[PDB]
Design a protein around this nucleic acid. Sequence first.
RNA 1: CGACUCUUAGCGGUGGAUCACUCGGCUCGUGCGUCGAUGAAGAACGCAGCUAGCUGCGAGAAUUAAUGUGAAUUGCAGGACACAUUGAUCAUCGACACUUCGAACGCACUUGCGGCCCCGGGUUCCUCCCGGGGCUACGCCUGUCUGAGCGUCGCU
RNA 2: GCCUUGAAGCCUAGGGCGCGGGCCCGGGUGGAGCCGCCGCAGGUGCAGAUCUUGGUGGUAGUAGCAAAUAUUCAAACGAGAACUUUGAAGGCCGAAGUGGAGAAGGGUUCCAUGUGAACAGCAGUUGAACAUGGGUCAGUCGGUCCUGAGAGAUGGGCGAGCGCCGUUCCGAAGGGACGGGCGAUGGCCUCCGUUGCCCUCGGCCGAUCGAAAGGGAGUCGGGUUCAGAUCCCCGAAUCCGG
RNA 3: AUCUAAGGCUAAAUACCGGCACGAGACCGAUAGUCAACAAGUACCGUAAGGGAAAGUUGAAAAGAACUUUGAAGAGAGAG
RNA 4: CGCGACCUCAGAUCAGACGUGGCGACCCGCUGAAUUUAAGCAUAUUAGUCAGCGGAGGAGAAGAAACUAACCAGGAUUCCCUCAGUAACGGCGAGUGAACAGGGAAGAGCCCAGCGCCGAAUCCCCGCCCCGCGGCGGGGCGCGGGACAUGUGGCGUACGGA
Lengths: 134, 122, 52, 86, 50
Amino acid sequence: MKFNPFVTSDRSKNRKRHFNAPSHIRRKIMSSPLSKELRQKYNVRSMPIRKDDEVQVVRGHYKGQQIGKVVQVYRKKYVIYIERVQREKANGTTVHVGIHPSKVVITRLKLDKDRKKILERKAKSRQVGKEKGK
Amino acid sequence: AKIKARDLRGKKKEELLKQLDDLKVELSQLRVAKVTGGAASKLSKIRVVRKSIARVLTVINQTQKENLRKFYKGKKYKPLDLRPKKTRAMRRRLNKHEESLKTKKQQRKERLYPLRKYAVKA
Amino acid sequence: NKHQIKQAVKKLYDIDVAKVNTLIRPDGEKKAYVRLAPDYDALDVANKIGII
Amino acid sequence: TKGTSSFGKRRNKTHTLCRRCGSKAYHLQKSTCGKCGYPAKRKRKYNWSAKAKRRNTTGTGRMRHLKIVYRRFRHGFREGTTPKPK
Amino acid sequence: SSHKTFRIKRFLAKKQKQNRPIPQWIRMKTGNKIRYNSKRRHWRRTKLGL
RNA sequence: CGACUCUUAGCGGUGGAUCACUCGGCUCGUGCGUCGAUGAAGAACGCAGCUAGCUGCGAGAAUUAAUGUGAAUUGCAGGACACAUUGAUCAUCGACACUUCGAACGCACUUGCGGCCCCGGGUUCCUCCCGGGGCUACGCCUGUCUGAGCGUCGCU
RNA sequence: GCCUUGAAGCCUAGGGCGCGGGCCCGGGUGGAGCCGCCGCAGGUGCAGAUCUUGGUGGUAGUAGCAAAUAUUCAAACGAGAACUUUGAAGGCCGAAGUGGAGAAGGGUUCCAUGUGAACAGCAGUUGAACAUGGGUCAGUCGGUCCUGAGAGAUGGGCGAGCGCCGUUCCGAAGGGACGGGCGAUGGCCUCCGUUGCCCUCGGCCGAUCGAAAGGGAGUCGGGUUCAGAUCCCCGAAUCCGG
RNA sequence: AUCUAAGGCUAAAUACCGGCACGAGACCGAUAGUCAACAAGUACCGUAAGGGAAAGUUGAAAAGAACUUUGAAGAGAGAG
RNA sequence: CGCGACCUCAGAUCAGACGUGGCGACCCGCUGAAUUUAAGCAUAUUAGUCAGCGGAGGAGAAGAAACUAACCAGGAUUCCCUCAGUAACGGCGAGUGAACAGGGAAGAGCCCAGCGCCGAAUCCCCGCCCCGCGGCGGGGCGCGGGACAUGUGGCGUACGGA
Ligand SMILES: [Mg+2]
Ligand SMILES: [Mg+2]
Ligand SMILES: [Mg+2]
Ligand SMILES: [Mg+2]
Ligand SMILES: [Mg+2]
Ligand SMILES: [Mg+2]
Ligand SMILES: [Mg+2]
Ligand SMILES: [Mg+2]
Ligand SMILES: [Mg+2]
Ligand SMILES: [Mg+2]
Ligand SMILES: [Mg+2]
Ligand SMILES: [Mg+2]
Ligand SMILES: [Mg+2]
Ligand SMILES: [Mg+2]
Ligand SMILES: [Mg+2]
Ligand SMILES: [Mg+2]
Ligand SMILES: [Mg+2]
Ligand SMILES: [Mg+2]
Ligand SMILES: [Mg+2]
Ligand SMILES: [Mg+2]
Ligand SMILES: [Mg+2]
Ligand SMILES: [Mg+2]
Ligand SMILES: [Mg+2]
Ligand SMILES: [Mg+2]
Ligand SMILES: [Mg+2]
Ligand SMILES: [Mg+2]
Ligand SMILES: [Mg+2]
Ligand SMILES: [Mg+2]
Ligand SMILES: [Mg+2]
Ligand SMILES: [Mg+2]
Ligand SMILES: [Mg+2]
Ligand SMILES: [Mg+2]
Ligand SMILES: [Mg+2]
Ligand SMILES: [Mg+2]
Ligand SMILES: [Zn+2]
């Protein structure tokens, strides 16, 4: 249950903030989980997604274990574009198909300076969380 | 192609003005191309050049202002573009020293008869 | 006005000028017709500007 | 003769655009607006029309100076400084 | 009226530019509802405020 | 057998009711309680590669710098961005800049007329012409400067 | 408790109940929520109110498309011609015109190319419609200047007060200038203006506004555009100021 | 019996249909509720003061009907 | 026949400050009605109310008795409950209409002038040195200007007191 009186718990206000958020927030909302292996090694559960991450699809028509990469992150509509998932149009031209990132599993990352930094803060937060709860 | 203010802070008046001119020249040229028919590549630069100019002109006025206020510092009278800028009302108040002035009679009373710390039932 | 205009072209395109005439279009944009001294040719100068 | 034909002599304008108000009321012979009272310093504003007030108020156009005053109060009208460099 | 003034001439000019049709690339954006202008004006009908 | 008129049902039309949804209102309460001559409120005109409106902004004009974040914006284009020179886009907001009217302030509302000092062509002040910059409102307070009076006296 | 193995709502020559208010089943459509019991509460049940808002009928393929003498033959473009265009013939306006130019007002309606949805109360290959582009050039043409009937600030007066009266009326009302003297002034301080005075003459008599037909110096001919000319080009002049 | 005018200053307990931020509801649910759920004090009427609207919903995703054929085209039969 | 003065009085693009206008829900001061009720109407009521003109703050105003009372007496102002639909007003008709005392929220008191003493013992502006500078202050030296005796500062205001 909730106890704090300075935030909302109201249907209309959640939706309004969601459908009118700026981009530096849509990044977090457009987060996606990891696989079991990566969780174990890094001791983390979720990262925001990027443009050369390797991913699977879990739910829908295009689920299966075929693995692909990310191509384009159309935040304005809360979707992403994978390389092989695509359909033919009337003319005989292939085009991509958007899918929400909650429905995908990341298998390989795209690391760099900032993204290593980000993982470490998540690790230490959970670490003291376990050691102090326990 | 790139212009960064971080590079330009240390340079001088005249070099910046020379660099300023080359930009405006390039701007007049591109507008000619725009009208006679031009090309996509040369139209997607008109935005770039406009912003580059604003950088330069911005740097000039920042350092220019910041030598003047250093010059007038420590003086009774100074221009109005350098005085503090708040509400009119806040400019028609008392100076934080004129607030804490008291007559001798008020002072003397406070010395002899102040509030003393106490308690009861004990 | 006409004096400003005259000096500007002399300072830009490195040229000399007899006279000018002005009007204001219905779009609100002002326009000039500038005649050069006979020493100078306009087809010449127009290509330096890069215009035909 | 007081109808259709008397509406053919209309070629002589009475009102014209104000210089403070934007609207079209500046009486030429008499030199007053009729919605702003221009040549007077004080604005025509009567309290027997709520609607007539709420079309021109402090909250109607741009507010290109108050908009920042509200942003500056929220921190204490600070000035003369910068955040930490990098 | 052939003896205009400068204020009048700016005023008309804006209204003239402000009476053109709509671009077609606007019809394809995400959250577009706009089908046509419906703020246009035709000299022989719907005179001006002036 | 025919047309035509009437009744009922099935199907197709016209027109937009009911039903289900909702980035809107109304009502109550909590906290704070801030405009401007250092030029407000409001008005006008303008600014996008492709742009009319709404929105945002002011000739540095769909935004500059500076911090926080950390790989996009997107209807089409074209290019940039190397994210271990560092730094795309977003948000914030402490520096800089902020057209014409308007209490509106050189005199007047046609954008018409001027006056003073300074720089640069006008030559090398010497005066006419051009550009450019700074001043040029009403009332009022303290003090300075020059002044008026068969006002009250003193003095030679 | 019911439910994507199908909720609400809607239709129904179907089966049935209750004196009635009303309800339960069956079939079709449709696509996401809904009901029964005990208590609570209310913006709670329509045939009307020359009711309010929206929509649809008979009337009715009706009344009508009649003020101002008038059309015809052929050819061309074109899917396509009573109405466009070219030619020819017959006719009207009849110089106080159905002609050629302008003020007030309108404001891109102007000019070319293309189109034939809509509009042009029939039609249209046309359009003052729709779309895309282009177009207004001045020392001498007008404004700007002057004042007119008149409007309107200052001083003054009055008024609870925003303010009102009034325009020479209860005002130290012009910074107006000038010949002379005085020291200075930068230019070769010659000649000057000058910031400064001592002198020196000073009336005016009321700020300001007010007419694109009143008053107000001076430009004419020829040629040139899809569209502009006393403005552009050619050629001959002239006013003002220094 | 009770006060000492014709001079002056002062916080707290109180008010708040405009403003800046926040939360909540036995409320209305597109002819209702703000006139204004949408480019609304907009379009538009008026010489001016002023008056002042109508207008919500494709679908999970445009995958928004390629190609054939009749017709001047609009509209159609097929296919998807 | 120039200077000191004020009866006094004007001027300056003189040096340095200031005021004007806008919003206006709550606040302060003036001005100020008619529908309507009375089953008619003229006093009354509607109403010190709408409209109107001014002036502000984050609250404003009021405010530390020229009081209430008649008690074995309380003791600034402001809000709440109650006193009270009362005492009183009134074509005594329709209609209007408070205060004290009691119980609570909160709670804080103080300056001048005039009498009277102190070598005006007092204030502003320019100049120079040093700290501090973005709510322009402090300390020191100028036979540097000025306001003030037609009255500046210290002691002291009825709590009765000094
Ligand atoms: Mg004292
Ligand atoms: Mg001209
Ligand atoms: Mg008409
Ligand atoms: Mg519907
Ligand atoms: Mg659904
Ligand atoms: Mg209800
Ligand atoms: Mg009812
Ligand atoms: Mg009915
Ligand atoms: Mg009935
Ligand atoms: Mg007939
Ligand atoms: Mg006829
Ligand atoms: Mg003609
Ligand atoms: Mg004619
Ligand atoms: Mg005309
Ligand atoms: Mg027709
Ligand atoms: Mg035509
Ligand atoms: Mg005049
Ligand atoms: Mg004339
Ligand atoms: Mg008192
Ligand atoms: Mg007080
Ligand atoms: Mg609706
Ligand atoms: Mg509905
Ligand atoms: Mg509505
Ligand atoms: Mg005021
Ligand atoms: Mg009566
Ligand atoms: Mg009656
Ligand atoms: Mg009566
Ligand atoms: Mg009364
Ligand atoms: Mg009132
Ligand atoms: Mg007070
Ligand atoms: Mg009782
Ligand atoms: Mg009463
Ligand atoms: Mg009491
Ligand atoms: Mg208590
Ligand atoms: Zn006006």
